[PDB]
Design a protein around this ligand. Structure first.
Ligand SMILES: [Cl-]
Ligand SMILES: [Cl-]
Ligand SMILES: [Cl-]
Lengths: 523, 508, 507
């Protein structure tokens, strides 16, 4: 029967069984629930891959790392996830199926454990995980592992919009992955998690769909790289770039947004106001300089007491940005427009305090009482110093000048996993004079910021696995990790501009954690 | 008036079986033997009047040290207790005590005797010899309780219903001592086995074994010297360092390092024509300082008005050059604005402090201008203006005062070094820095508003005094008048039980 | 074949006529295997026959549930069932022997032939099904007391045949092993007792404090970074911040984090110079006794260098106060703190009266700028506490790694500099808060080495593990000098007592 297939090289089924008692589902809730609802029986009889149903055991992983985890709830099953947007509550357990059909030349063990509600998961060692109901499975296991997940609880049922905890199922690497195939290959174990609701699972109260926050599902825009725009300067994207970031510090304040839609740093939604200034202008006698007293981005008064590092859309690099000052008089409609340049490294660039300084091409022709808008165009470089050294995109300006220090900054960003580098969305800024460093990398396209902001989908885990697909051929070009903090990572070493089909798009495939091992992508 | 409490039967953990993960077992000896709660003692005296609540406790594992230790390895519980109360009377006394079951989420604060009778209750005579057995059922609205959720439970209340009438015996005054014993009912059980001592709300509260001499003041980097109690009506006791709650929440400007207590770190700038320098501050960890923080000032900012003399230290990264200069900070100066990010030092040089370099003020002592009144300049109980004149002090830790008649604050006192002049070198803090460290790391939940501490001589075993450690960061004792305490050099504080703020402690 | 040649051994049933009471353990604990805290070991092709890969004595510390329960019981009796898991595959060869070693027999030095002479099992590296070993409570009394630390049977795991396997790429194939335990049916606890009174049951812990939140134990300054390096050239023998795991202070170590380099006493002028002699009095202001079995008064500096600070004095009757910049040279022949005298260099030869108590507050270290830069403060050279008139006495032992690939782990802070170009590096073996913690919570050491894991709480990831030795020092798996790159909120977590052969994963 096995002759020539698997060939007894591999464990067949697991004899271990989790030491959990049976637990009632939604039947107990019937006298106090509003309604008794029904789930399509096909959904109850057929395993389907869970959202966040992929994980990997690779040689980069170390014992103790939680490779997969989830709380009991409708998010364990994509059909139930869509259904849950239509209900107020739930109760009952699941059947989960884990596929671990690793290559016969691999070794290693995984522990699956059920941790009860209100026990902290944060910091558990393998020694400790053994003290919960648990199962230890070999990474070569051929038949899927069946884990029943009961709805241990102290109430009749759960509300979708509450924060009462449920049982968590945990998969942790118990033994490191070892392999003895003779070749110079790496036999990572690709694993899949499938689920179906137990017969005792049921939804509780029918309610208007898509309204409740905690049930909105996460999505990623279908737009192409070329069709999107940089989030750090009002210009389109051009290529995808990965490189090492050990030398410099990646800490932009524009294009900073979390997966569930919280804006960070100086990030705002309009792709046009990303390096604009609006306010009243004042001449400095004897020079071509003007001092601009800042209004808000919508022409309201500017409040320096906001918990923001600077007004929204303030440039997040040191350099000299050339554009045009434009002004209109409210009485006659006279209009004036003059070449102008702002230096963000200048000591008089203090947007947190409310003032910015431009150097213009006039000593007059700019009224004091009129509203003035700086429209940016490009960057410039002082030609007498070293080539390509003036616009330092990864050097933050001092938003309060020499006074004080930068506050309320969005965190810095760095790869966390062995072999991984940041993935940058690269645009080329227009040069206006000299030999400026025109490379501009942002962590998220502005259209993604817009999307995440409007669709406030809660993150099911800390990383969303994305695969980049060529729709003409159907092929995957690379896979990457989109972190909740709003940045992308890929598995590559060295600088590289990605060679991308013009139609390529990002496709969300599974929720994963920071220990997911990405397929090699480079070249 | 009866011996039976008007309570229905109440299911324990049996109801939870369909929804609990597992079934557990408690050692049968624990179920068959009454055990005294650590604070399961109270006294009936002729001073007591109707309405006074002599003792109270909520149902839970903390009434029984065996169950309390067991709970550190379990996730939940459900079910009630049997309470045994022992009355040390004799036939020649008279008076009544009421015991009452108050249901979850009802306020105990303020009941009249008439009203307490309206709960399920028992009326017990002071002459009762046989122990009184009270069932304490786990009235609730869920299947069971989780340790980490702190659900409210039924309370037992003991109140004086009729005053005690008895002859005295000489000048010794007769009192009825009462003790409360407990054991789990058969319907009590634990629910889910979990790795022991992880779940935060099951850690027991303790107080460091250290001796006063071995501890450190929390307001200046110097050892402690003596314990001092005094009346505090005149001034306002409101320090911002060494302020920490029993369950480990830091307050005010309090931080953990005992050496960074009166230090400053930052970049320094010369003031033209003077020997003064202005320091733009960092945090104690050399990070940017954020004035928007919900703190009165950077952590470790001095919390008194005075002139602190120390040494400014600086190191150049390029060559490793180092410079050190005598310096002095006035915390009452208008240029002492650490909340805004700036402090002013008066140094012994006009040339030798470089810009852009990291600079550290190491404090040493306090100084006094000798031409003014002796012992007048360092006012320990006057807060600096952390933003000098641009506003008022913000996010302050609460002020501290005794509320119980006959009680005064207990201070941990040291002597600040004097560098010049005739300064007032007394420094009192509310908590030793080692206690702050202990409370912070061991985040033990407070079971009530007061932790009863006893001070013990370990050689003889004798208790010298008891004091009340309030959940907030301060200690009180029973004494009147200022007094330096007479302490054995090896004496230490020992935690005995949580009590309620009505506890009246024995004088010295 | 898979059966250990042991007779049955009665557990607590035999103790019933002499035990005070009959107790019950939660049956879930009896029916579920739980990993022993140090129940991991690895089989690598570098291993040779005879190497003891793992060992443990029978007792409650093998099981965290039973370990917690023992804190409320007076004694125990009975055996365990051990489950050992082997992560092999069909393409491996090699044998492991497990052996039962009786209570008072030494394991130290056994050859493979001899280990075969105990009751034993020979397990092939390819075995998939877990190995079940009964571990009986062989003894000569009715039961064991927690407070009497009776010796028990030991399980031994030894490499019997070398591992034969291919590697994949540059990753070398290894068989990881895990040891699981659960109480036999004849195991039981004996006498209920107050739950945390008995000393020998207190478990060992390590403060949750952050490196930044802790303090150096050799000078009154905060810590800054973690540093590991090779130490073969020099002698690592500090006398401050030296404390054993079960809370015995060593050398000149004391508890106050501020008195770590202070001096107190009455002062005397040396005529014609800016030097003063301090007649030292104990840190608690008492009379000083040189007979104390200590190298010097507690808190005396443990390095050779010039420490600059401030002398402070107070006149008792008038209340006057004086303060003067001052400097102590620990290598000067007049630095004799063991005898009771130390010499300061001040900035005045006037204004320091006699009979008054005087306190030196340390601030930093100083360097003679005309000499070689970074040459004056030698942290790893001890001063001569008795000057020329004798040698140092009652020192804490010197410290070195014993395992190939291991180096000391130092808690590093940077001393303030006052003048010159001094070596501002200061390394201590234990943070002062760790000294405080061990001293109060006097948990007995279950072996010579406490395995610690260093955790980044943001990601949950373990960054490295290290060995905290009972003698009070830490070692890590690294080669070469290296400042550790640590998240600012990382903390040390205690994992398990392990045996002296435990091999830790490299950085
Ligand atoms: Cl709708
Ligand atoms: Cl403890
Ligand atoms: Cl609390």
């Amino acid at each position: 029967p096995s002759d020539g297939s698997t060939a007894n090289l591999v464990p067949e089924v697991n004899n271990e069984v989790m030491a959990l008692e049976p637990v009632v589902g939604a039947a107990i809730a019937a006298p106090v629930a509003g309604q008794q609802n029904v789930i399509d029986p096909w959904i109850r009889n057929n395993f389907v891959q869970a959202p966040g149903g992929e994980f990997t055991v690779s040689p980069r992983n170390a014992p103790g790392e939680i490779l997969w985890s989830a709380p009991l709830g409708p998010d364990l099953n994509p059909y139930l996830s869509h259904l849950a947007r239509m209900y107020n509550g739930y109760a009952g357990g699941f059947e989960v199926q884990v596929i671990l059909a690793g290559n016969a030349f691999t070794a290693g063990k995984i522990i699956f454990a059920a941790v009860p509600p209100n026990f902290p998961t944060e910091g558990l060692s393998p020694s400790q995980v053994t003290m919960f109901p648990h199962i230890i499975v070999d990474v070569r296991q051929l038949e899927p592992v069946l884990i029943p997940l009961p709805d241990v609880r102290n109430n009749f049922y759960h509300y979708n919009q509450s924060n009462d905890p449920t049982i968590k199922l945990i998969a942790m690497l118990y033994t490191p992955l070892r392999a003895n195939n003779a070749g110079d290959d790496v036999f990572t174990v690709s694993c899949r998690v499938l689920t179906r609701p137990s017969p005792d699972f049921d939804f509780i109260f029918l309610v208007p769909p898509t309204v409740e926050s905690r049930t909105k599902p996460f999505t990623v825009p279908i737009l192409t790289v070329e069709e999107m725009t940089n989030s750090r300067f009002p210009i389109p994207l051009e290529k995808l770039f990965t490189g090492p970031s050990g030398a410099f510090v990646v800490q932009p304040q524009n294009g900073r947004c979390t997966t569930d839609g919280v804006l960070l740093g100086t990030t705002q939604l309009s792709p046009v106001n990303i390096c604009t200034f609006r306010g009243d202008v004042t001449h400095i006698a004897g020079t071509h300089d003007y001092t601009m007293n800042l209004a808000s981005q919508n022409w309201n008064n500017y409040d320096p007491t906001e918990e923001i590092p600077a007004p929204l859309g303030t440039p997040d690099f040191v350099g000299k940005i050339q554009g045009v000052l434009t002004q209109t008089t409210r009485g006659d409609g006279s209009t004036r427009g003059h070449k102008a340049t702002v230096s963000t490294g200048s000591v008089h660039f203090t947007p947190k305090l409310g003032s910015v300084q431009f150097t213009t091409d006039t000593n007059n022709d700019l009224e004091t009482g009129q509203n003035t808008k700086f429209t940016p165009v490009g960057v410039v470089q002082d030609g007498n110093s070293a080539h390509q050294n003036e616009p330092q995109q990864w050097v933050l300006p001092n938003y309060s000048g020499r006074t004080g220090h930068n506050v309320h900054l969005a965190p810095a960003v760095a790869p966390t996993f062995p072999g991984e580098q940041l993935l940058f969305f690269r645009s080329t800024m227009p040069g206006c004079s000299g030999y400026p460093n025109m490379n501009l990398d942002c962590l998220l396209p502005q259209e993604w910021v817009l999307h995440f902001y409007q669709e406030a989908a809660p993150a099911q885990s800390d990383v969303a696995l994305l695969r980049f697909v060529n729709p003409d051929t159907g092929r995957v070009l690379f896979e990457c990790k989109l972190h909740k903090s709003g940045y992308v990572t890929v598995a590559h070493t060295g600088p590289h501009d990605l060679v991308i089909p013009p139609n390529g798009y990002f496709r969300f495939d599974s929720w994963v954690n920071q220990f997911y091992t990405l397929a090699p992508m480079g070249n």
